[PDB]
Each structure stands twice: as C-alpha cells, then as structure tokens.
Design an enzyme around this catalytic site. Structure first.
Site, PDB file in Angstrom:
ATOM      1  N   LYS A 186       0.883  -1.159   0.000  1.00 10.37           N
ATOM      2  CA  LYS A 186       0.000   0.000   0.000  1.00 10.37           C
ATOM      3  C   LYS A 186       0.924   1.212   0.000  1.00 10.37           C
ATOM      4  O   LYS A 186       1.581   1.497   1.006  1.00 10.37           O
ATOM      5  CB  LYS A 186      -0.866   0.001   1.260  1.00 10.37           C
ATOM      6  CG  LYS A 186      -2.268   0.579   1.076  1.00 10.37           C
ATOM      7  CD  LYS A 186      -2.260   2.077   0.731  1.00 10.37           C
ATOM      8  CE  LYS A 186      -1.839   2.938   1.907  1.00 10.37           C
ATOM      9  NZ  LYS A 186      -1.716   4.374   1.499  1.00 10.37           N
ATOM     10  N   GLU A 262       8.836   1.086  11.534  1.00 10.81           N
ATOM     11  CA  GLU A 262       9.900   2.080  11.421  1.00 10.81           C
ATOM     12  C   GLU A 262       9.154   3.399  11.540  1.00 10.81           C
ATOM     13  O   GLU A 262       8.395   3.795  10.649  1.00 10.81           O
ATOM     14  CB  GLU A 262      10.654   1.980  10.099  1.00 10.81           C
ATOM     15  CG  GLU A 262      12.036   2.658  10.129  1.00 10.81           C
ATOM     16  CD  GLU A 262      12.023   4.121   9.687  1.00 10.81           C
ATOM     17  OE1 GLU A 262      11.626   4.996  10.477  1.00 10.81           O
ATOM     18  OE2 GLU A 262      12.437   4.400   8.543  1.00 10.81           O
ATOM     19  N   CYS A 296      13.227  10.359   8.554  1.00 11.98           N
ATOM     20  CA  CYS A 296      12.907   9.756   9.841  1.00 11.98           C
ATOM     21  C   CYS A 296      14.030   9.979  10.853  1.00 11.98           C
ATOM     22  O   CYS A 296      13.773  10.251  12.021  1.00 11.98           O
ATOM     23  CB  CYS A 296      12.659   8.255   9.655  1.00 11.98           C
ATOM     24  SG  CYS A 296      14.050   7.339   8.956  1.00 11.98           S
ATOM     25  N   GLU A 393       8.797  15.538  16.412  1.00  9.00           N
ATOM     26  CA  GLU A 393       9.304  15.476  15.052  1.00  9.00           C
ATOM     27  C   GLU A 393       8.563  16.507  14.208  1.00  9.00           C
ATOM     28  O   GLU A 393       7.335  16.441  14.071  1.00  9.00           O
ATOM     29  CB  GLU A 393       9.080  14.082  14.476  1.00  9.00           C
ATOM     30  CG  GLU A 393       9.580  13.895  13.059  1.00  9.00           C
ATOM     31  CD  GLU A 393       9.542  12.437  12.631  1.00  9.00           C
ATOM     32  OE1 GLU A 393       8.428  11.880  12.478  1.00  9.00           O
ATOM     33  OE2 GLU A 393      10.629  11.841  12.464  1.00  9.00           O
TER      34      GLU A 393
END
Ligand SMILES: NC(=O)C1=CN([C@@H]2O[C@H](COP(=O)(O)OP(=O)(O)OC[C@H]3O[C@@H](n4cnc5c(N)ncnc54)[C@H](O)[C@@H]3O)[C@@H](O)[C@H]2O)C=CC1
Ligand SMILES: [Mg+2]
Ligand SMILES: [Mg+2]
Ligand SMILES: [Mg+2]
Ligand SMILES: [Mg+2]
Ligand code: NA
Ligand code: NA
Ligand code: NA
Ligand code: NA
Lengths: 494, 494, 494, 494
Positions: A186, A262, A296, A393
């Site tokens: 996906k 992750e 990330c 973040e």
C-alpha cells in the site's frame, strides 16, 4: 554527471496492480495526486479500498500455494529476478528520477544520484541473499537429527510513506522477495506514481503473477484493510508513531500477524568541542535539511559544546541562508517544496510554536514562495530540552541548536526522549567516540558523519521509533518463519 | 532412581520479589493457591497488582542503568551466574520437584525426572550463550567502518502459565539473563510457589538486586499492568490465544514494546500405514496424555491411515484404559489431577460436546475420583474435522482419533486449522517423511517421535499459535536490540 | 534447446596473462595442446615457467597494495564485477562450450548445458557473497571493545586440473575475488584454452590489472614455482593425491603459505535392496560414466545388496552397452574421448589389471575407435575389496560392481579406504538413509541421487581426498585472513 | 588475595597417560625436568617415543569409533564434562599454580592470578560451545534437501611449548573436546608436570578412556611421531617457526593430515606522540617483559615517535631498572628465571649481538643471579631495522626501542617483517587508531593496551607467524570436518 530531466514526465501507470495486471478500484473511484512544486493535479489514481485489498491478498495467497511457480523456484533464481528488476530500474533511471521529483518534490539531481542509486544497491544487495540465508543442523540431546528450515513468513502486507517513495518500496521488496514471500503493498496517497511504474517493471522482469500486488489508496481504508486482514501473515510499516500503534493494535485484534515498524525520531547530533568545525557544520546542515527535512532520522537536536557554540551557530546560520530553495528540476536547487499542504501547514505550526515558546529565531521562519509548498530554511538557537520543538518530530526544514557543557550531561539529554532512531557524534577523540556510541540509546550511531546508509548495515529504532531492523542480514529475520524438524534416528553419533 | 518425596513440602516464599527482597502487596491482599489433588488451600500468596508491578519495573530499570553492576558485568560472568543458579536448583531438586507436584498436580516422578532435568539443561545451555551472541563488522560502501552491537532489549515483562511452572520460568529467564536484560515476571495464579522459591535461589546465586523481579497475582491486574507499562521494553507471553491478542493490543496501545507469543494449538499427529505399530501407539498416547493433556503442543488430532485404523484404535483404547490415575506422589501414578476446578469443568464440558456431536466414546468420559480434579483418560473414535473436539484446544486427557486415506488428504486436513504449533509424522518411508515435514504448516515437526524438546532447538508457532521462537540460538533474537555504529575512516580498504 | 556448435572454433588467446596484458614466455617457448577426439594439435601455447610465475606474483602483489584500486573498491562493487564477468561468459556461451569440447573432449551438449551453466551459477552465487561475509563484534571480558576484520588472505596461487577446465576456474575465482584476493592461476597443460579466453573477459569486465593472472604451462615448472613462491600467501590445488603431497611439502618448505586440497577418490555408491531399481541403475551409470569417468567423485565402487545384485548387474550391462561413444560435437554422443594419450593408456592398463586379478569382464574392455582416445564403456562384476580396480582411482569409463549382504558390512567396506571424497546411498527407508549418511566417512553423501552439485553446498574430502571445502559459505573460509582488533574503552557495558 | 604457596609442591604424576591409566615408556627410559630457579632436578618423567605415541593413537582411535561412549555422548554432556574439569582445576588451583611456577619459573602470583584464571575461563568458555556449533540447511537448486553436519575432525595430535604449560593445554583441549574429537598431546619436555596432573583431573571429571592421551617426551622423537603418524587426522602446533616447517612437511609427506600453527613473532608496539605517556610506558614494559619475555606476541619492537622518544626511553629505562628479579615464590618478584639453560644462553647471545651491532645498551645486559637462569631486564635504545635484535625473536627480557617520524613511515617499518602475530597502537586519535589497525599486517592489533586475551576473541598469525586461529568461535573451525548430505525429495518448495 546527470542526464537532463523531462520536467513533465508522462504517467503510464495509475491503477491497482494485481496478478501482473492493471485494475480500476471495484468502486471505480479515483483520487488526484498533486505536484507539490505547483500545487496542481498531476493525474488521478485508482482509489483502492478493502475490497481491492481482498482481491490482492487472495492473489498473493494463490501465488504462495505449495507447488506454485514462486514456491518451487530455486532460491538462486529469485536472486536472478531481483537482479533483472534492478537492471530494468536502471534502464529507466532518468524517467523514474523525474517522476519521483514530480510527485514528491525532492530535487531531481538527488532523485537521480541518491534515491535511484540506493534503490539499485538495495535490490542488488538482496538479490545476493536469496540463496544464502541458511537454516541450521542442531546437536540436540538423544537419538535424533534436528534441523531448521527457514521458510517464508507468507503473505506480507507492506505499508509505506511518501518521503522516499522508490527507496521505501525497494527496502520492503528486496528482503521479502529474496526470502520467497509474496507482497500486498500500500503506497502513500501523496506519492503513488513511481511505485506503480515499478510494478510494470516487476511484470517485465518475470515475477509470477500475484507475487507483488500494489494497492494505491488511503490509510484508514486500504492500509487498515491490510493491517486487519485475516489472511495477511506479516505487516511491515513505515510512518507516524500514531499509525504504528494503530497497526500493532489491528494486528493483535485480528490474526496475530507478525509486525515490524519504522517510525520517526528526534535524533540528536552531538558536536564535541574538538570536532572539525567545517566538517561538523556542513554535516549538521545535511543531517537536518536533507530531503526538505523529511527524514525519519533527521538530526533535529543539534547539541553543541559551549566553547564552540557561538561560532558553530554563526556558520550554521550562514549555511542555512545560502541554501537554494526553488524548482526541484533546476540543477541549482538544494531544497524543493514540502510534500503536501498538510505537512506544509504542520511545519508552519511548529515554527510558530518555537517562536511562542521562546526559542531564538535566527533565520527563515516563513513561506519561501507563492506557489507550491516551499518553506524557508529555519534555524532556532538556544533551544531547551522542554520545548515542544525540541521534543516532537517537525519533519521540515527547521533546525534546533542546543548548548551543552559536559559529555555526561549530553548523554542524559540526548537519551531523554521516547524516540531512539539514530544519533551522531562529531569528535576527534577515540575515547569520546566509543563512550558516546555505547551510551546513546539509538538504532544507528554515526561517528563524524551522518545519514550514511548501506544496504549491508541494519537500520531501525529503539523505544518508540520502531521495532525490528531493515537492511543487512537482519532485514531477513522478519521475513522468515522458522520450522524445526526433529527426526528419530537409530543411533546418534557426533 | 528417584529420591523419596516430601509429600507436603514446606512453603518458604509467598510474597512479591523486588530488588532481592520480599514484599507484601501494597494492598496487603493475598490469594489462595490450591493443591489440585485434594482441592485444599496450600497457603496464601501476596496478590500483586498495578502498584506492585510499578515498583518492580522501577527496580528493573534502575538495575539496567548504564554503569550498574549488571550492565558492567562481563558477559562470561552472566554465564557463571546462570550456571550457579542451575547448581542451586540441582541442590534443591528433590524439594522443588515435590513443591511443583503439590501446586500443579503432575506426577512427582515426572516433576523430578523431566521438569527439573529440563530446567537444569535450559539454564546450563543458555549460560553458554552469554558471551557468544556476536554482533557483526560490515563491509559497507564508502570510507566507513560499520559494525553492530547486540545490546539487551531492556526491561522485559514475562507472563507465564501454569502447565510447566518451573520449566516455563527457565525458558524465559535463560535467554533474557544470558543477554543481559532485566526481568519483571508474572507467574500463574494457579502455580506461583516454585517460581517464588527460585527467586530465593537467584538472590543466593549472586544476581544483582532488580535483575529478576517476580510479581505473583492475577492476569487482568498484574499481567495487564506489565503489558501496558510505559517503561517495559519487551513482553513475552505464554498462554491462551485469547490473552495473546489482549497482550499484543496492550503493547500497541501503550509504548509499542516488542512482543513474542507462545499460544496453544491443535497439533496433528499423523500415523501412515507403514509406521511401526507398537511405537506409534505408545508415542500417540504420550503425545496426547502427557502432563494431564496440559501441553501447548499436545497431539490432539491423531490421524490414522484407514488400513491400520481398527488395530491402532484397539491398541490405543487398551493403553488409555491401563493408564493409572491417582495421587501424584505415588510412584505408580501416571496421571495426576487437572490444574484447577475451572480447567476440570471445561474439559468435562468438551467431553459432553464430543458425545453430543456424534464422536464415538471408546473409553473414559467421566470424573476419575471424588476428591480433587481427576478425569478418566478419554478416547473418541471416528472424529470428524468439523467437530468441536477436533477444532478447539481441550487441554485435558481427551484423545481424538480421525481416519484418512491419502497423504495429500492428510496434509490438507492437518493444515486446515488456525493453529500451527507442532505436528508429527510416523512412517518408515524417506520420501513420505520429507514430503510431510516440508508440507506441514507447523513450528515443529517431529518424525517418528513426539514432544522431543531440546534447549538447542527452537520452538514456537505458525499462524495463531504464536510468533517468535524460544530455545536455541533463535531464543536470543527477541532479547537483543541491534545498534549500528558507522564511523568515517580516512581510507577504507578490504 | 542447444545452439548449433562451431566444430572448429577459432583460438584467440594462447599466451600468459599478466596485468590484463598478453605475454610470451620469457623463454619464448611454447607447447602444443591437443584435440583428444582426433589426436591433432589445436595450437601452440606459451610455456610458462618460474620466471613467468615471478612476473605474475609481482603483478598480483602490486594489485594487492593498500590503497590500490582493488583494495579500496567497495565490496559490493567486487560483486558487480563478478556479475559482469558472468554476463560476458553467458554472451559467449556457445563459443566457450565449443572450445571446451575441442580442447577437453566432453560432449558439446554437456559443455553447454552443464559446464557453462554451472560456471554462470558459481560466479553469480559468489558475486552475492562479496559484501556479506561479516566479521564479528565480541563481548570479551574487561573494559574493551573487541572485533574481527575478515581481510583477504592475499596473493593466491591456484592450480587446477583438466577434467572441468572452465568450472574449476570458476570454483577458484569466485570465492577468491568475492573476498578481495588477487590470483596467480596455473591451468592444466592439457586444457589451457578456455581459461585463457575467460582472462580476456576478466579484462573486459573491468577487473583491475594484476587481480587475476594466468600462467599456462607444466606442473613441475609453473605449478611448483607457485607452490614454493616466497610471496604467495595461499595455494589451492585440485588434482592427484601424489601432487597434493608435493604441494603441501613445498608450502611447508617455503613460506608456510596456507593450503587447501581437492584430490581424488574411490567413492562408494551403495544400493540397498529396497531401492527404486530403474532409478538406481540409471544413477549408478551416471555416477561412474559422467564426463568420461573423469570426475574426482565418480561412484567407482558400486556396492549392490545380494538380493538385487543379478538384476542390477544385468540392467547396468545393458545400459553400458547402449552408451553412445563418438564425436563429442554430435548431439547423440554421450561419451567423448579421454583427455590425452597418457590417461588413455593408464585406463587400458587398469582394465588389463582388472582382468588379470579375476574381476569378471561383463562388457567393453577395449579401444572404441581407431583415432582419438576413445575407450569402450567397461563393466566389471564380482569385484573384491582387495582388487587393484577396487582400490585405485581409474578416472575412466570403468565400472566396478561389488556384492554385499548387510548394512553394517557395507559401512565397513565403504569406509575401508584412504579416500573419502563422496558416497551415495539408494534406499526408500528413512532409518537406513540416516544410518548410512551419518556413518559414511565422506565429504558429500548423496541420498537417492548422485553428482548433485550446488554453488550453495560445500564440497571437499575426508582423509586423503583433500582438506578444506569449496563452494557454499565454507568456500570463503580459506580466502579470508582473520584480524582481531581489541580496543581499550573507558567503561564497557552490555 | 593470593593463598600462600607451597614452595615445594609434591609431584604425583610423571608417566605417560593413555586410556585413563599411567604407563612407563615402552623403553622404560625417563628424562629429568629441572626447576629453572635453582638448576636442580625436580623429578624423572617417562620418556615417550614413537612406540608410546602408537599406543596412544590406537587408544584415541578406539575411543573415536562410531558407537563408542564418546561418540554417542550428547554434545551438551561434553559441555558438562568440560565444566566439571574446570571445577576440579579450580579446586586444585593453589597446587597447580605452585607446580607451574616450580617447573616453569614464572612468579607464583602470576601463575595463580593469570595462568590458572585463564585456564578456567578458556575451558568454561568452550564448555558452552559444545552444543552450539551448528551445521547448515542449504537452499540448493533442484528437488533436493541439502544440509551439512559438523563432525569432529578425529584423532588430533597437539604439540605444545613450555611458556604457558597449563594455558596452552587448555587452549588445545577446550575446542578439541567441545567438538567431540580425541587427543594425543605432546607436552614440552621442559614443562611436563602440570599437564600430567591435569590428565588425572580429566580422568576424575569422567572423560571416557582414550579421549585424552598425553605423551611426555622430546620433539624429534614423540612430537615427530605424532606429526608423521598415518592415523592422526589433524595436528595443532605451537612453537618455533623452524619446527612449524618441519610439522607441515611431515603432514604433507605422511597422510595429508590437517595442520594449524602458532609460531613466533617480532610484534611492533607503536607509540604515537599523542599517547598517554604514563600508560604507554607501563604498557610497553608489560608488552615486552611479561612472562620473562617468553611470549609469542611480545612487543619486541617498540616504535616511539621522535617528539616523545627521549622522555619515553628515560621512563622505560627507569621502569626496567626497578623490575624485581628473583625467587618466583616471593610475592615481590616480578621476574623469575628463563625456562632452561638453552634459552638462557640464547638470550645472552642475542644481547651480545645487540652490543656488537651498535645498539645502545641502556640497562641490564647480563646475568642477574649466580644460581638459576636469571637475566637482568635489558633495554636497547636507538635500535635500527637491520639489526639482528630488531629482526629475530629473542624470547627474553630484552627490549628494543626504535624512533620514527611519520605514521606512513611506521606502517611500512612495522609491516616489514616475515612475522605478523600481533601489533599495538597507542594514541588518543580516532583516525590514527583506525588507520593503523587497518594497515598493520598482524593477527591481533591492540589499541591503547597490550596482551589483552579473551577466550572469546581469536588469536593467530599472519605470514610466518602461523596459520589458523585459536580461541573464540574461530577456534572450532580446525576441529571440525564438514559433511554435505544432499537428499532427493519429491518436490522442493521454499
Ligand atoms: N610460539 C610460542 O609461543 C613459542 C615459540 N617458541 C620459540 O621457539 C624457540 C626455540 O624454543 P624450542 O623449545 O626449541 O621450541 P620448539 O619449536 O623446538 O619446540 C616446541 C614443541 O615442539 C616440540 N618439538 C621440537 N622438535 C620437534 C620436532 N622435530 N617434531 C615435532 N615436535 C617437535 C617440542 O618438543 C615442544 O613440545 C624459542 O626461543 C622461541 O623463539 C618457543 C616456545 C613458544
Ligand atoms: Mg497520518
Ligand atoms: Mg484466561
Ligand atoms: Mg601428474
Ligand atoms: Mg627447538
Ligand atoms: Na504528489
Ligand atoms: Na496450585
Ligand atoms: Na587439449
Ligand atoms: Na622444568
């Protein structure tokens, strides 16, 4: 040396990929994907949902049946197929790099020299593992012969984000295919194009139908359908911590499928006073700003020892001010636009948050252009641990510079986070480097460098940054189901 | 050669174990633990809950701090400590075997010769792994030196069942301690005593305070507090599939702690027509009836080839009728009582279902004694796949015998289950053995044997029977957190 | 589907290959290479001697210097180069298969479908290992960080025979190059051509000059110069047991270079009475007659259980009698000529000895053609262990059939040999298969098959059949020099 | 805390050990072993020769036969036996340390705290490996199941020196027994006592008769008989380069037995100008003088950067002058006598050569006592690369200090040697440490330390310092014979 780009690459694939063929969504619905540099629609893409995911999972399950072409194929041949896919991707490298930039916004030079290069290296690395992930023969007690078979985990649902479309697809396909699994992927609604084209190359490479199925669509719909599917054996997810929880909950509530995640981070980049100043400044800039800050493992907490703080900040500000923001297809462009309107707004919000909480705005802080989603390279000085911009973040071109005094102090501050994806240490001292690399609670610790990825080295998070590892030999563990076979023998001898 | 058992061993430990000290529950509440052979209360045990778990986690976290005695201890020394614990357990073998029998119900001869022997072998095997689970040095692209450190995952929550109290504790402690982790264990409310006594030996062996903490108590209270704790890094659970889901959801809903699960099964034991009759009959009996049928991997679906069905059934019925049920402390007793009243009634319910659904009751079928939780060895013939007793885990002395004709038929019928913990094949033919061991979707496939465990060989389930593996080198994977360190070097050379 | 061969392929390379350039021998001398099918000279080839070996070694040493292109090259890139070399060999597959047949004598169909296929598979398998043979990070006692670097052994001398010219070159080059070593290869004087052409492909593939050096020439001259060279770090030899001794002695007498050896054998092929007759007969035929009987692991001792001896012998004779001997370029040819006149005469001598010692000559026994070195497929029955043909490696189309009664007996007779390269067992019984595979003292034991090689599985001898293993992950061990680096750190933590 | 030693320990074992029994030599001859501190005979020891070695080899071979107690023993039990042996050696630690000192000459404090501790650690480490050295299950092409069995190499001849009598015996026995081999050990004639007493402990621990056999005696007699024996499968040797050559030639000239060698060295210890002076001086002193300078890896070439040379030398000379030479049983003694008269004279000869060739004698240079083989701690300054004392292994308390200017220069000088056992680098700089550890051609490179051994980390030489590695997982490779078993299966599936 970079081939001139086609700034308006034609789109050839925009449907659901199942059994090596293209399908519209059962509902016939389509969704627009936008070019972040202009804010204009590129094209419409089939909007997959649960029913489409169901068809893809059934196709994957069929291709995984005992005796099927994919199951009987020699492991070495799976390696040949991966190498063929890599050759096809290389053949279409210029086109893929441009399409990646059009849909995502990253500079074409980077899509070409970085992203594509890394995709090729990842696939070629894993092609080599296809027939080398051995099981074991075990000297168990008694008159028995005991061994293990490393079998494929099965139908693997892979949900990926938009920051590195092609590379994320390769990081997922490489280990899964090398070990003989089948995939239902996906892709992100923001960047579905490049992955769909790669699907065409997967068919061209010779992969049996159903081995790789791709369903473009949204998260709560297509993504959730995969996570909750009763016949999906394993799910790999890269994205937000929030959705990571949703995925693990869906896995536990459905069939106990295996899960690897992750997620993001708030990675600390520690600059000791004995570091090479010029190198540390350039690397700290790269650590934070690379890929429009959409990494990330972005070095979003730049810790600088007090004795070199003033100079470090002065140089970092100058570097940020010189950073070229513009059309990603222009060779001079260092920074393209953020991926979409949502991220754009979110970053503006974080910048205002930093100003509100007292962080010193040193440069940037606003919108960089009228059209698209461009944000000025922004630097905050005198950032404190308790500030929101020091904890969450941001995923944008917003740098936080913090001041510290001792190595013992910085260890504690760097580790005081629910994140633990990566960290870095810049120092010329042997002991400081070893003391810090050991002490830092992070999946990857870079020493005198940053964002150094190798298909050979594992990557993943500690704490809330994720679980499991991708890349290297470790990347094969989550794609393997271990079976022990213990056989009674007449008389066991050493 | 088994020493005379103390049929009523004194209980020395019955509290919460934290920092090598004994504590009552914060609430001061206690719960009774019962002797299943008489139904009488043995003693009261501290009833741990969330607050007690919080105290344990904090103690574990402190013991895991960088620079602590446990973190600085040489890996080889962790091995010495495990070997010392094994020696202490061996010194107190006669006592522990009797205490195991008293609280759980299994025959003393078995507790002594099987459980304790396996506990000793598991701890001694893992002691050897303490300084041998190497990280790697990796030939990454570019001028870098890249390597991985295999670090401990951290604070590990371990929730275990009542079927093999001591062994389950050793299977969890062995790998966790060998790799330097710290533990917060929640033992089963039905059998908390032996694990608590072992806590005393852990302190005596010299393990630093806080390395192993044990919280007796209930599941929804103490168990859930561990599974949902914000500071527990990993949770390993063994028990029902139902609670396995609850654990994975709790992990996802809390801090994304890593999860491994060992759930039940409905393991198929396949007897081909060329199998050694006498051997297959005795092994099939053992496969189902071992430990009062309370084994996760019990061969509860005995498939027998039509040509030998009648004889196999006759012999199986005779063996079940001769099985001695009685006081676990009597040397002649082969089968003790079920663990508690809940399991006792659940099993009788299954037997009544078997009768109602048309299975042929060949022997047993009722209560075996007026006092305690004893059930007659029961055998059902002509069992069909759609029957409740052929689908659900009974966990009692209830055997299912199904008839089949072909090898392809039996493969499909055996694999048509949501469980996949184990399986067995009895045949003299090389090809049939290889075909079946490869085709069966199970974590462990025994050939011409059953319930053959070795600390050296991994064990775990496929599908809904669990995820992850215990025992062997594989058992160390879930207890390790991988860190990559990538260092810039002047000039990389091969 | 095999492409029509060029029955008279042009020779392009016939000199000494050093630093990617072609050189005549310093002496200017040449030697003829003969076509064994006609007995005529194909062409002259430079006769390398000690001085030529000295130039080659100096070139290899230079290419191995720290900082050189080959030493600094990314491990993944050495993999790319091996893959490129494989692609080039595949491009010229038809030509190489023809040249192999011309110089060696084996059927073109086999050269193409077997030899070239295995060469490609071996090189591609090793290309995958280039960046995956990791060193280790070790949890040593004390405040230290300890790890190992897997470095290349260095300048590797590789001496190969004439039975599988191309394959033997690949078996050597694959692991050596994957691990970054440099090579000085001495090809057999009987079959130097194909290896010399591959040298041209090594240059085309892009390997740095000096990485692979090939010196055609004789054994006591070029071969011995390599084995006794003071600057060769490791020598790998495949050939006679006699020269294997010479090699090991030369290594010990010179610089103590590392040594691995693959010598001959007298491999037992054991047929139990319950074996599949038709399959066993055909496999026993292939086992002995493959490649004109010129296989190190040839099943030259066919042990057949007494109950099936007569029928087996009859079927074997019929098969041997129908085996087509003739021009290797004709598609119907199953067996070509022996490699040279020396082998031809030696084989006839063994047949004479077999007759003299009382073995029953069942078919063949003489010359098959007037021109070339063709020998009739020969079968001896009622062979006894003490017979010369039952003890010495014949290396020709001469089959020995022996009779046995018990499994215990055959183990003893099979193992009573100074050789121990391979063995086989044909049976349908699981226990017999496990009993024998464990008991036979051989490097490879095949069950219900023979000559099944895979680049993934190691191959090598027990006893005097050699030392060390080739192929698989094991094939890398002898090409790696292990370095331990132990660093003092401030404070070691797990 | 060292227990007071018995300065005159009694001798209980002084014969040949075969089949767990004590035997006189067939010739009845005995040889005296001397106390190097006094020059007086301790006792007579059976003088084994070829005939005794033959008896030992036959006993080992019998103990290794398929079906024997040693072959059938569970691998985990082999571990239990090694652990038991360690426990007995620990029980008799004070005694063994005293006997070691008596026969060898090393300080009792060192024998107790270092040698005995290392022996215990080595045996306990390998005990853990007994049931963990797995073979592999390999994904070979085609319809086959292929795996490898890691079998014992067989009868292993082990020839050891006199510098670390007990430790060398442990380094050899640990890996050999952990892997199921049988041993014929030839201890050094200068130090046979401690090894013989350990044989008594091996019997006491429960090892089957014939598993370990010890033959005291001379080299050209007993040692050579082992090296040339037709029924010895592998030989491991530690000693002079000269005899290492003899061993390899013997192996090649006899039965091609497998060989591993640990020879001497002329190890470079490099002190960069940025090193910690105090630490570097103490470590360089230890590096050279440890064990009376009788260490294979002694830092016999102390390279010191010119800017710190003068100070380093002055401090080194001061430390050497303060080193206490005397009775090894006295707690204040740092240095005992050399092992024998031959070594004593050889060292004095090297000192004479150093004086003759112009090296600057800074201290010591002569005999340190009128009785015993005591030599004064000697330091030579301004040593040049071409001097004899800079090239040949002295194996005595004679230190060579050389001056260098650049890092590039010292790499070349350090590597310009036929030896390559170990090396060290003292520096605070991260880059210098990585540059040097990579560039130095040695088996072990220590950084900011020296002589740091761990049973977990491999040790062995590059070039003429030997081949193969001991300790760690690598130490098991030479004691394993690999067997590939490849089975035909109905249909292979991933
Ligand atoms: N690598 C090391 O740790 C050691 C190196 N050496 C070096 O060797 C030099 C001379 O000392 P040596 O005691 O004479 O060592 P050596 O190499 O002659 O003897 C060592 C062992 O090998 C045996 N041996 C001797 N000759 C043999 C032969 N012909 N065949 C088979 N085995 C034989 C000896 O009996 C003893 O067991 C020393 O000065 C030192 O340089 C000595 C001891 C240890
Ligand atoms: Mg979202
Ligand atoms: Mg429950
Ligand atoms: Mg010859
Ligand atoms: Mg000597
Ligand atoms: Na887009
Ligand atoms: Na109880
Ligand atoms: Na030829
Ligand atoms: Na002595």
């Amino acid at each position: 040396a970079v081939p001139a780009p086609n700034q308006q690459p034609e789109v050839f694939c925009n449907q659901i990929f199942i059994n090596n063929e293209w399908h519209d969504a059962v509902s016939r619905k389509t969704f627009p994907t936008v070019n972040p540099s202009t804010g204009e629609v590129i094209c419409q893409v089939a909007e997959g949902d649960k029913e489409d995911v169901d068809k893809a999972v059934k196709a994957a399950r069929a291709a995984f049946q005992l005796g099927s072409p994919w199951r009987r194929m020699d492991a070495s041949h799976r390696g040949r197929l991966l190498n063929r896919l890599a050759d096809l991707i290389e053949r279409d490298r210029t086109y893929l790099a441009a399409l990646e930039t059009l849909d995502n916004g990253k500079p074409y030079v980077i899509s070409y020299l970085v992203d594509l290069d890394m995709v090729l290296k990842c696939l070629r690395y894993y092609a080599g593992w296809a027939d080398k992930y051995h099981g074991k023969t075990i000297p168990i007690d008694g008159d028995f012969f005991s061994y293990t078979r490393h079998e494929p985990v099965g139908v693997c649902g892979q949900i990926i984000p938009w920051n590195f479309p092609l590379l994320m697809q390769a990081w997922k396909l490489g280990p899964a295919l090398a070990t003989g699994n089948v995939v239902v992927m996906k892709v992100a609604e923001q960047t579905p194009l490049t992955a769909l084209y790669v699907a065409n190359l997967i068919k061209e490479a010779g992969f049996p139908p159903g081995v790789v199925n791709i369903v473009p669509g949204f998260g709560p719909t297509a993504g959730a359908a995969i996570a909750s599917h009763e016949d999906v054996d394993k799910v790999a997810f890269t994205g937000s911590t929030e959705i990571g929880r949703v995925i693990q909950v869906a896995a536990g509530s459905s069939n106990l499928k295996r899960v690897t995640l992750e997620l993001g981070g708030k990675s600390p980049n520690i600059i000791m006073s004995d570091a090479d100043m010029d190198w540390a400044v350039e690397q700290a800039h790269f650590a934070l700003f690379f890929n429009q800050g959409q990494c990330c493992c972005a070095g979003s907490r730049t810790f600088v020892q007090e004795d070199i703080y003033d100079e470090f900040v002065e140089r970092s500000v100058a570097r940020a001010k010189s950073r070229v923001v513009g059309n990603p297809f222009d060779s001079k462009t260092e920074q393209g636009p953020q991926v979409d309107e949502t991220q754009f707004k979110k970053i503006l919000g974080y910048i205002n948050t930093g100003k509100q909480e007292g962080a010193k705005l040193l440069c940037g802080g606003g919108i960089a252009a009228d059209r698209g989603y461009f944000i000025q390279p922004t630097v905050f000085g005198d950032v404190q641990d308790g500030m929101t911009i020091a904890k969450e973040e941001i995923f944008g071109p917003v740098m936080q510079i913090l001041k510290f005094k001792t190595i013992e102090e910085v260890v504690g501050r760097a580790n005081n986070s629910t994140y633990g994806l990566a960290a870095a240490v810049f120092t010329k001292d042997l002991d400081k480097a070893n003391y810090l690399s050991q002490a830092l609670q992070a999946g990857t610790v870079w020493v005198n460098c940053y964002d150094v990825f190798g298909a050979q080295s594992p990557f993943g998070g500690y704490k809330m940054s994720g679980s499991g590892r991708e890349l290297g030999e470790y990347g094969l563990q989550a794609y393997t189901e271990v079976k022990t076979v213990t056989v009674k023998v007449p008389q066991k001898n050493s």
